[PDB]
Amino acid sequence: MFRQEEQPKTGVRQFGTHTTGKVDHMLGTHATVRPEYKDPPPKRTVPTSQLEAVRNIETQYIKARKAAEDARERQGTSHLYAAGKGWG
Amino acid sequence: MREIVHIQGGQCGNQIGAKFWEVVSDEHGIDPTGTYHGDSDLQLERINVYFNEATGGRYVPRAILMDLEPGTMDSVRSGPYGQIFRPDNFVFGQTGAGNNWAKGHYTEGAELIDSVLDVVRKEAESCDCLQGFQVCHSLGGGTGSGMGTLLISKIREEYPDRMMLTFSVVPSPKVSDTVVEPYNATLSVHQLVENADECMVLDNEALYDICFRTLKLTTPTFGDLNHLISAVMSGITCCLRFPGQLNADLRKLAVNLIPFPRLHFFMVGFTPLTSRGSQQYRALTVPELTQQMWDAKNMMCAADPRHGRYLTASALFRGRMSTKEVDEQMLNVQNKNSSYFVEWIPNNVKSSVCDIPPKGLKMSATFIGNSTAIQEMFKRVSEQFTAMFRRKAFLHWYTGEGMDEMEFTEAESNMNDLVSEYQQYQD
Ligand SMILES: Nc1nc2c(ncn2[C@@H]2O[C@H](COP(=O)(O)OP(=O)(O)O)[C@@H](O)[C@H]2O)c(=O)[nH]1
């Protein structure tokens, strides 16, 4: 109806939504933390399975960590009350 | 609908609180995830006393895990029955007391006592009718004894009508995990004689003796020791969570077992403890339970009961049973040895029957004893204190923070007054 043209894109170089400054942790959820943005586990206690998988063989470090975990489990066992079963 | 707010303090208390919730959530039918999977209907009648309702049928405990080192609470969360607790209740410190009673009570516990009071205020206001606050800690520690007793002092000024049950682990006679155990113990009992309504005295070598000569365990661990004290904690509240023939709340144990306001230090004991070989052979009968329960070996305190007189004792029986074998067996133990019982209080033994036994047992019993024979334990701790305080060793950490050397005198003064009043009822 008229000779209609496009305005030129004259503006500042805009960064995407993936940057750490413009990231919205609650996007479209009405002030609730979005999924896959989880709370940090305390002290990041890695399981020994990943350390087994990284190395080829169960080395001395792997065996020492296994021994420490086994000692912790043996200390945690009550030997009078089974987990999920009654005394004895 | 009488709720208990559990507050765990220190490395021992968080470890013994984790083991305590392993026997409550399992017996109430709570899975490790948190939902309900109980096979009976009697559990869901009383869940509110130790759990809060949540979305999706989840039940979260009324537990406040209090510590000054983060190395204890991360172990509780990572263990079994561990992620049931709220993340807000997991209150933590950074510096850590380091087995110093002084630092927990005054300096580095002052900026945490406000952060633990509002959690307790939020929990206590949420429930409608409190029965009391239950705590579990040690007295030889620095985190659970120093800042733990500061919590008891500031919760009694807030709620002066509600009860207090302190499952306190005293320093052991034979062994000592910490050098400054006599300093921390005497200052912790200085608070506990006034503000605490009741005190449950536990000793490690008492637990070690039970696990050795009664349970026949070759190598007990701390998990063995924690779950025996956990059996007592579940045994006191067995009436609150379940109906019985003769009901008995915590305050029914308060009126019976306490003659005078300073007579609130009790010694505990869980009755049916057998080795794995001896489970099948020994018949589980009520006079057999009575014979084991009054024994000095089975009782869970290092003070020997034969050296003094029971001022008042109480027995809490759990399971389907008849009243007489509870009844005249408590009469039998008053007449067979009347010297071991006090004279001016007739019918010293209190009894109660609960209809729901703990898991894996047809019958069980739990003992509470207000003996004057526990003066030997407090006199022994005072003996170690006066040995150290005369030469004034291990004091520059205490007096270097802002407490005076005069304060140690009043800690010993009412310690000697606590055994002074224990002596004048034994005679
Ligand atoms: N029942 C029990 N007692 C423990 C355990 N670990 C340590 N203790 C006791 O706690 C005392 C040491 O106190 P500590 O743990 O440092 O107390 P905290 O400073 O308040 O954390 C020792 O005398 C032990 O007898 C446990 O797993 N179970």
From Swiss-Prot, chain B:
InterPro entries reported in the protein's UniProt record: Beta-tubulin_BS (IPR013838), Beta_tubulin (IPR002453), Tub_FtsZ_C (IPR008280), Tubulin (IPR000217), Tubulin/FtsZ-like_C (IPR037103), Tubulin/FtsZ_2-layer-sand-dom (IPR018316), Tubulin/FtsZ_GTPase_sf (IPR036525), Tubulin_C (IPR023123)
Localization (cell): Cytoplasm, Cytoskeleton
Residues where GTP binds: 11, 69, 138, 142-144, 204, 226
Keyword Transit peptide: no
Keyword annotations: Cytoplasm, Cytoskeleton, GTP-binding, Magnesium, Metal-binding, Microtubule, Nucleotide-binding
Entry keyword Metal-binding: yes
GO cellular component: cytoplasm; microtubule
PANTHER family: TUBULIN
Miscellaneous remark of the record: The 2 beta-tubulin genes of Chlamydomonas (beta-1 and beta-2) encode the same protein.
Subunit structure: Dimer of alpha and beta chains. A typical microtubule is a hollow water-filled tube with an outer diameter of 25 nm and an inner diameter of 15 nM. Alpha-beta heterodimers associate head-to-tail to form protofilaments running lengthwise along the microtubule wall with the beta-tubulin subunit facing the microtubule plus end conferring a structural polarity. Microtubules usually have 13 protofilaments but different protofilament numbers can be found in some organisms and specialized cells.
Protein name per its UniProtKB record: Tubulin beta-1/beta-2 chain
